[PDB]
Design a protein around this ligand. Structure first.
Ligand SMILES: CC(=O)N[C@@H]1[C@@H](O)[C@H](O)[C@@H](CO)O[C@@H]1O
Ligand SMILES: CC(=O)N[C@@H]1[C@@H](O)[C@H](O)[C@@H](CO)O[C@@H]1O
Ligand SMILES: CC(=O)N[C@@H]1[C@@H](O)[C@H](O)[C@@H](CO)O[C@@H]1O
Ligand SMILES: CC(=O)N[C@@H]1[C@@H](O)[C@H](O)[C@@H](CO)O[C@@H]1O
Lengths: 390, 390
């Protein structure tokens, strides 16, 4: 009864067997099948089991251990062994030389300045495969338990992992039997032309060329010497006196700007927010209603909570049984105004009392306008008035 | 003799009195005036004596102490006292509510999330006034001291501060008298439409509107609640379940990108690199050559260093006096090939020996092509061959 409360809910009625449903983060589905239990379905997680790094980008660097080799006007070209260390970034320039700084001659002497580049912070691009993602789905049967209604905690339901690969999941719905699932990872957005870009806790789904065209230092998906370090390094020699080098500073904020609200996916508890869909097929044949032998409850009920309408025109009520028959079925029927002609269906099918002092929640779909909610049988049979919106 | 060695040097000859010169970081000037000492001029610093902050921009923020007030479908509008704390950033949104999360009703209940914004790192924009800047200039007379040549240390010269305001500086050139200065801060780049933007050690000179159009949080030049914090804050409520807020991350690298090589000024030793010019007028009347009574040196000399050409066609030589007359003037003349007709002028005017064993440097301008450098008088008078470039 977890979908109750939730606006993006979806009512799906089975046949007489198989049922089709579509799940997506934030959406919920309630299935109905006749002679079968009502079930709530919700996609709770999407896990990537160690994908792949297309590339890694440095977004914040260091610049240290600066060295330099400067020749005299005559002495020719500068040389630093650092010019081979691929961790260093270098650049040649000329500077004035003369008696004043160690040369017999006067003129431009060459220089070469190098500095070790070090990455402080980075982001990674990953290649995603629905097929290979692992999905976690929660099934919560409409048992009517005193605390079932919209309980976002998971103890009222079974958690199922749908391995695109490994395949076809089966489920133990305690006291109700077994159900089966066979889903298909759906989605618009072509995925093999997209990339999961992670920056700490955040992460979007970008295109491939856009990601690869990124003007930043990088390491192969497969550190070993960053590539294109100059993108973040600058050399300066304004007055032909000496040459300085400097980094550019975190491109973190810069990146976010470029990712302006793109397909973000970032983080539902250090976890993924799957982009689109999950079409499934459910088979209930191995499932069965609970308590179809039970006696009709003959005692009277008392409204413990209060008929409250859901965003979809259904009503939810919580009653308490004070009779002496438990376990027993709850006499529930929705009638019209001339008291005779049933006008509404139960969503929480086959309502039953399990314990004297344990309330029972029931969701029903009353007709539009004026109706009656008759709980129990006379004696003190409850007759509640209801008017439906619109 | 500090300008010797330096490519951006500038030779300026006085009259018979006043002289005009232009200084700029990296450039050097050598002045000559006849019956007057040769002097080297160099603008070493430019100091801003506590300018003004037009505005201050936050380029890196925090987001903490997150709070929220969420009403039930019925309860109406959300309210947080944080909505008044100008340190907090807030945003209203709606979320699904129902029995499952604390409401008797079902529907959208309003929420309002707020979080305290804190600036981690910032940059300031300052309004610059040449007039009011203070300039430091080094005057280094061509004394010919054994270590004078291009000595970038300042002990061979006087440091003078030219206060645009306070005004007209006077100078004590020990043993040489006094000289005077009256400069004018020049520059293209209109300054009252520009701004000095500082980011730590770095700093450029940007335009006013560009600086003010900056899409970042800011504090008045005259903290008291940053303005436009949202520029760095984002709110999200994907599934109508809860609303999260998040900052955007350092815009440091982003800024640098936007400042692509603009008029940088950043840092010559935690100091300014003045953008353009400084036109001055020098009066030497109160100056005088040194040792114009001295005897002609009669003894012989020895070349201690070695005639070496400067980037401007001048030559520099260092000799040592072995005679017995000191203090005395050094017999120096440049002749042509038929040994009789002086072809070159001295830059280091009135060369004199001050101590037997203390070498003397002399800079001279030999004619183009073949010439003679005759040092001393016969006996062992030095006759050196020289060929001039081009
Ligand atoms: C090989 C070398 O140059 N070592 C120095 C190290 O001693 C120093 O702590 C560091 C910070 O300046 O720079 C270099 O790592
Ligand atoms: C949402 C709600 O009704 N609260 C209940 C809570 O009292 C109980 O501890 C838990 C276990 O069944 O389920 C829900 O969390
Ligand atoms: C007024 C208030 O909420 N105090 C808490 C403080 O105790 C805590 O250390 C900090 C970090 O979470 O957040 C807030 O400052
Ligand atoms: C550049 C050069 O010739 N070095 C000298 C140095 O020997 C001396 O200590 C100092 C003081 O006069 O002047 C210069 O620094």
């Amino acid at each position: 009864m977890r979908c109750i409360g939730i606006s993006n809910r979806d009512f799906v009625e089975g046949v007489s067997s198989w049922v089709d449903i579509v799940l997506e983060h934030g959406s919920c589905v309630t299935t109905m099948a006749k002679n079968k239990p009502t079930l709530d379905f919700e996609l709770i997680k999407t896990e990537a089991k160690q994908p792949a790094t297309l590339r890694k980008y440095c977004i914040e660097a260091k610049l240290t251990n600066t060295t330099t080799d400067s020749r005299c006007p005559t002495q020719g070209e500068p040389t630093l062994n650092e010019e081979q260390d691929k961790r260093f970034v270098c650049k040649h320039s000329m500077v004035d030389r003369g008696w004043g700084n160690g040369c017999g001659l006067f003129g431009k002497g060459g220089i070469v300045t190098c500095a070790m580049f070090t990455c402080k912070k980075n982001m990674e691009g990953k290649i995603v495969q629905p097929e290979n993602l692992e999905y976690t789905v929660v099934i919560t049967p409409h048992s009517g338990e005193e605390h079932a209604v919209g309980n976002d905690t998971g103890k009222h339901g079974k958690e199922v992992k749908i391995t695109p690969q490994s395949s076809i999941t089966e489920a133990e719905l305690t006291g109700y039997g077994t159900v089966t699932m066979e889903c298909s990872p759906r989605t618009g957005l072509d995925f093999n032309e997209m990339v999961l870009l992670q920056m700490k806790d955040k992460a979007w789904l970008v295109h491939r060329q856009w990601f690869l065209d990124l003007p930043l230092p990088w390491l192969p998906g497969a550190g070993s010497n960053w590539i294109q370090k100059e993108t973040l390094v600058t050399f300066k020699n304004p007055h032909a006196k000496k040459q300085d080098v400097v980094v550019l500073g975190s491109q973190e904020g810069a990146m976010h700007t470029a990712l302006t609200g793109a397909t973000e996916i970032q983080m539902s508890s250090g976890n993924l927010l799957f982009t689109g869909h999950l079409k499934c097929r459910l088979r209930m044949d191995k499932l069965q209603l609970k308590g179809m032998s039970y006696s009709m409850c003959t005692g009277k009920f008392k409204v413990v909570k209060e008929i409250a309408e859901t965003q979809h025109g259904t009503i939810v009520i919580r009653v308490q049984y004070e009779g002496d028959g438990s376990p027993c079925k709850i006499p529930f029927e929705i009638m019209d105004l001339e008291k005779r002609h049933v006008l509404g269906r139960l969503i929480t099918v086959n309502p039953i009392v399990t314990e004297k002092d344990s309330p029972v929640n029931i969701e029903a779909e009353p007709p539009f306008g004026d109706s009656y909610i008759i709980i129990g049988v006379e004696p003190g049979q409850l007759k509640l008035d209801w008017f439906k919106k619109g």
